[PDB]
Amino acid sequence: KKFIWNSEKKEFLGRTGGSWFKILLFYVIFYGCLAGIFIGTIQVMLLTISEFKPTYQDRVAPPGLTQIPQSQKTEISFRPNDPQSYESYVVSIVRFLEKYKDLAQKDDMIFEDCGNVPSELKERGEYNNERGERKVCRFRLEWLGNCSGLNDETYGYKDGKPCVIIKLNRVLGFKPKPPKNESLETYPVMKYNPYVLPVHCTGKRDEDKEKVGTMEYFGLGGYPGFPLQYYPYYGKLLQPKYLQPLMAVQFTNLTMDTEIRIECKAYGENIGYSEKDRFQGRFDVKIEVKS
Amino acid sequence: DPFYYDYETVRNGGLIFAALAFIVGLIIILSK
């Protein structure tokens, strides 16, 4: 009963040729209409959103805090001797900082020298297209001391006492607000509380806080944070080739051959946290320089 | 700030809708 393939009375795979043509033509017209309808509605949807601002921005309320070595488990395990053990790290650091070289930021028509001192926020009008393509403040690698160097094509980084720079999640129209001068016990930090978003790293428990001996922060002019002169963001369409602020963190006194946990928590009023997302506001890393 | 959404009001409205639609359906299947 399963050899209905053909017969001398014209049937193929179950039906005739003229029926195959009728059904195929119907399905093509039907699905063509369905595609046109879906496309028209998706076009109306495209007409309900603008090009300079996302309609809903509440799902990114607390900005994240990422690092340069995007580890498979936020763990930095390598050997201070073997150069191939830490190749995966250095490769990502060089590729990340490849857009911050002095040669990359050479056009004066799209780059603006912010300054050697963190200043107030820079609002370049409204988010419309009435103005031309906004300028992006420059950020030379020299600001991250001891984690930039004047190395060749391969940034000879730190084998012993590694470097891990932190970055604030780029958000459109987000205006960072550092904590008030009434700091509720924020782990010794400089007195430059008004024009920089503080970020302080620490251990996680009584063990990690003891294993991690000394940490050295590097930033714009020497402050452990992000300068307000680089915010807010005006979208990729209006500000292409934008360079968000960077801040490096080096762990000098580490206990070699021991996996220790570090939590770099960014402080501020407009900076939220989440017990479910360990990256919203805060940031975790498991460093282990096994010799 | 545009980084805030009154989710409690929408959530409350959705729960009231779910309650009313269910009690209305119950009245529908209880024709008396």
Next chain:
Amino acid sequence: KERDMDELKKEVSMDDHKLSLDELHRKYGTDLSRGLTPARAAEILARDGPNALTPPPTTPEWVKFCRQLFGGFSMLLWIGAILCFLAYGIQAATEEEPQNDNLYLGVVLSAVVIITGCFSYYQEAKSSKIMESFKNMVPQQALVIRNGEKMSINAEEVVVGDLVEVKGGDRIPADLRIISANGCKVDNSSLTGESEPQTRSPDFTNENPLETRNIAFFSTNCVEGTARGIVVYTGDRTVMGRIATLASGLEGGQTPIAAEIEHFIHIITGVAVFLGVSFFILSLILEYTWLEAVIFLIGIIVANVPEGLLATVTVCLTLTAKRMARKNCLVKNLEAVETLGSTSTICSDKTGTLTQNRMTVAHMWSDNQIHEADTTENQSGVSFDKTSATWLALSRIAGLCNRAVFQANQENLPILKRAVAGDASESALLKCIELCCGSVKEMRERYTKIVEIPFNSTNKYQLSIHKNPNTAEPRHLLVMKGAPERILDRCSSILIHGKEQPLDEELKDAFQNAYLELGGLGERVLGFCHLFLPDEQFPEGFQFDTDDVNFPLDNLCFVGLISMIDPPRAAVPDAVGKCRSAGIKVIMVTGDHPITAKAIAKGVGIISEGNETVEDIAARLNIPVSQVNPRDAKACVVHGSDLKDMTSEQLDDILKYHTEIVFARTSPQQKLIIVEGCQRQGAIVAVTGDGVNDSPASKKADIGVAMGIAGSDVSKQAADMILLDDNFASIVTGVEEGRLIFDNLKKSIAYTLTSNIPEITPFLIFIIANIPLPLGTVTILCIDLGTDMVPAISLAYEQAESDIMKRQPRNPKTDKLVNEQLISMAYGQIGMIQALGGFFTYFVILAENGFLPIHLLGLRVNWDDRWINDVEDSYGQQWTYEQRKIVEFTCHTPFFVTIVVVQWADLVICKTRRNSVFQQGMKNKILIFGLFEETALAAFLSYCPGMGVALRMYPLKPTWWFCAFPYSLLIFVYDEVRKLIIRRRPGGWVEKETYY
């Protein structure tokens, strides 16, 4: 070696009844007047087994629970659970942080099968439980003569070869061989279907043990008289014992509904594995490994399995079975509720099923005029004229001259169903006089009987003389009844409207044609006459002792004939007409005499008035029957004697060329052969019976229908449906509901199958376009086993779109429950639109939150990564893992909501298959509540506090609720124009391609 055992039981029985009393007593070794010594009786009792059938095969309850956990649908869900745990095992050992989805899903599928088993088991068990409350087996002790003394012992203590005596009223214990009778009449109705009480004489009469009178049978009741006999057969070796043992050892077959579910699964898994395999090859051609592609194959196949269609189909069948139980039409098997509708050939029984199995006064004769009395079982018919003097005389002749009286408890019972002591004919007469002529108690004692004369062995006549209580004449009233040929010879005066006339042939021949009219109608006729004895020749003091001629045998006054027969039940003829209207072939199968079977056939509708048998044409042309061409005869009567000498091809031709067939004098084994002959054609068969002879026929039939009270226990157990009220019209109700639930199951199946497309398409394009997952797993559960359950259950409550009792029965080879048109609708057109609507809501959520749809291509690579917390959208923003996952889950929730929104329109269009929604109407209150509860539940799952934590379903921004509205409206409009072209153009395009 049970094959040979069953084959020796499909053969009609043999015997040794034709033996001289000496040869019998020599073969068995038994005293003809003393029986045997009690030690010999106990020696046999402990030798071959007590006189009782071996109990039925007990069915333990864990066996049928394990049965409900299996089958065909639950088996598909079982292979689905297995494939889920297989995919999960492949996912666990092979990759880091496996997803628990597959495990959650496998345990849910297992729970679905187990719960369906618990529910269906509780239902079938409830049916059998209420069935056990009908076994009222009262022990019945037999009168056995042993060692020369009469003793009453239990029926099981009776053995082979011993004298047994029976009295009018007692039940024949075992199979007896009569040796001496005294006007003894037994009741072979439950066994051989012989309606009228067949008498039992010691002399061998017919070569067939069933027809002869020298054999009493197991479970038969001696109506009147007393008799003696030697036990020839005992226990299971008896006639009804071999019949019951054959009934238990027969095959049930495959119900049509089950075969439809099986073919349904064939198509479900056919397309499921086609999609899974073609996408397995497609995924390997893209980039994914065998490890991943295997998970894709299993995911697509398991996803294409209707998880909730099992519970919905079960509840559908259960709902229709509920309505069956409401009308006292209980079904033992759940799926048996559907079989009546798919039936196309009903084999019915005459005695006790087509008829009331009770002698009833059919017609009367008075004033040379035939008067039909009401013969309904509940007395709901036309009442004859009861104001003439001829009736006032005939009613007294019958109410007085009759040896029939009511018993003790016969008070609260109705006039018909109450028990009467005596002859069956006298019982029918007593009931008709007690019903249409007041009461017979005070009417019988009003005329004090002086001298009587009972029925005679030759020239059977029954007469009696009574005093006259009239206030105008003291003459003695003499009455007599008997066969019309015996009364015509002893009559000279004729009563008419109150006066007398001579025996003129102008009205006497008019009496003869009336006798042949009521007789040829298959009825038994009797004649009643009376005369006023002259008080001058026989004064009030004279005593007419029953010795010599004290009464004038001739010169009597004939009042009229009174016929009688077992009438059909009340709604039996109308029901047969309804079945024929639905295209159901009605075939009578009974062991009764053909002269009565043909009359009842014409009287109920099996033989349409005007149609002629092969013999009727030869009689109308006065030519030999061997001359007429059987093709000129639409109806035909087939005698059991001729049926014994038939082949397969001959019976096939009997059923193929004759439209109205009546099988008479057929043995239970022949009934089974007939049912098999009907099944050879390929048509669904329903056997409706009551007696033990209907057991092997009800068992082998696609569906057996037993009478709940007028039926025997064996055929009641071997049947598949019970009529607790014996209302044969329930067969019509059943054939209607069986078609109704069939169409509604089609609607419900297309509904659950339409949602599969906007459930698998997210995963499909997730593999192809490499976009983030549009629809979640737990959300799919909240659809297939959450919201959709109430709408799909409500789809069973839909009514008829046209008259279903008008269309012909569905062809099993053509009208499948799930044909290739339903797949073209659900999977092809409606589900496709629903999938597009879901993807629209998906792109709306992502584009509004910053991820333009064009940017979503190839994004899942880094989107699903748990550590890349800087994923660029279309606006240059950096999204963490949990943030974008919150968006993906809050994108799964509206996809689920979109499913419900398009299911609104899908439910309204599936509610009607051909009619328009404006025509049918949203009168289905369960469907209205289905939509309200569906929507309220969908909203609750999104806005309940803690759902993004437990089920990962997050609240929705209200604009999401409207992203699906246009697609639903489109679905509704498209299906509406579809059904409109089906209405206006019933030819072929929209009808043979989409109408399922």
